[PDB]
């Protein structure tokens, strides 16, 4: 098993992961960080990504039907 | 005494291409000790330079003979008698674009230096050994004084 995909984290997947985490944290989810006093869980959803503490696995599908598993902690976040 | 350069110059031409600004003018100078072309800009409102005059130009750092090099400049404080009170024109700029003469394609030894005093440009040309310091990045104080004889 060897990965044939770019390791850089796309913005298309970054946005969807951020949205999923923001929607899940607002569902009375256990936080993976000690947050400051602040509302709008969308604002703190980026904090977990900056600290690489998001338990989400990205499954990339190929045209043939091949599945590739990637970790948010394994991806490279660049900005 | 950290003197980087010092000489006596004479103004040959001044503002040759008409006039554009109302407070700044171009200056063309020359020397007798070492052949060199000095070009700079000085304020006319403060320092009214005329044609055919001899002045003394000194480029150096660390005004105070006491301190090695100080952190921040204070305007009215005079703890250490510096070289600025003896002269009559002070500038503080930095050097950039260290290039030489390109006309002589084969062996030459003529080097040039550009200085920017926060907008006002200064060009120097001359000998290689005459320019002893003049590093690429250096904060240098310019000192000018009129010599009327």
């Amino acid at each position: 098993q060897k990965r044939i995909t770019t390791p850089y984290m796309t913005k298309y997947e970054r946005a969807r992961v951020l949205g999923t985490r923001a929607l899940q944290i607002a569902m009375c989810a256990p936080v993976m960080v000690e947050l400051e006093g602040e509302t709008d869980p969308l604002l703190i959803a980026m904090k977990e990504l900056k600290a690489r503490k998001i338990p989400i696995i990205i499954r990339r599908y190929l045209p043939d039907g091949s599945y590739e598993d990637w970790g948010v902690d394994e991806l490279i976040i660049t900005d | 005494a950290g003197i980087l350069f010092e000489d006596i110059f004479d103004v040959k031409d001044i503002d040759p291409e008409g006039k554009k600004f109302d407070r700044v003018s171009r200056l063309h100078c020359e020397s007798e000790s070492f052949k060199m072309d000095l070009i700079l800009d000085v304020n006319i409102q403060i320092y009214p330079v005329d044609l055919g005059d001899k002045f003394r130009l000194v480029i150096a750092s660390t005004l105070y003979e006491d301190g090695t090099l100080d952190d921040g400049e204070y305007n009215p404080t005079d703890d250490r008698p510096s070289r600025a009170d003896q002269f009559e024109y002070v500038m503080y700029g930095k050097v950039y674009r260290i290039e030489g003469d390109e006309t002589s394609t084969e062996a030459a030894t003529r080097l040039s230096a550009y200085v920017s005093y926060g907008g006002l440009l200064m060009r120097l040309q001359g000998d290689a050994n005459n320019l002893h310091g003049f590093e690429v990045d250096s904060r240098v104080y310019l000192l000018m004084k009129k010599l009327a004889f």
């Binding site: 770019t6 796309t10 298309y12 | 260290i98 084969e106 062996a107 310091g133 003049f134 690429v136």
Partner: protein
């Protein structure tokens, strides 16, 4: 300079991109070296590193520490210059001729 560049280029990280970009940067790194020799025999300078005129070494100075960061930065910019997988190229190109 040539041996240092081609020694630092043959690494485990640099063998991930197209060799066309590597030849394109080899065309530029080689051309910078020809600019240095003409300036060095212009005034007369020995490269052993002992000549009492000290300013003649400040015209075009290239040190091996700052040349590695340049290569790393350009190679990393070539990584981000690649188009992201998943972008809508049809809709993007459809409006480029609109305005």
């Amino acid at each position: 300079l040539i041996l240092t560049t081609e020694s630092i280029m043959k690494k485990s990280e640099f063998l991930c991109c197209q060799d066309s970009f590597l030849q394109e940067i080899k065309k530029f790194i080689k051309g910078v070296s020809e600019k240095i020799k003409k300036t060095r025999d212009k005034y007369g300078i020995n490269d052993n590193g002992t000549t009492e005129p000290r300013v003649l070494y400040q015209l075009d100075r290239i040190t091996p520490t700052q040349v590695e960061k340049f290569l790393e930065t350009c190679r990393d910019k070539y990584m981000r210059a690649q188009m992201e997988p998943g972008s809508a190229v049809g809709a993007l190109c459809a409006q480029s001729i609109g305005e």
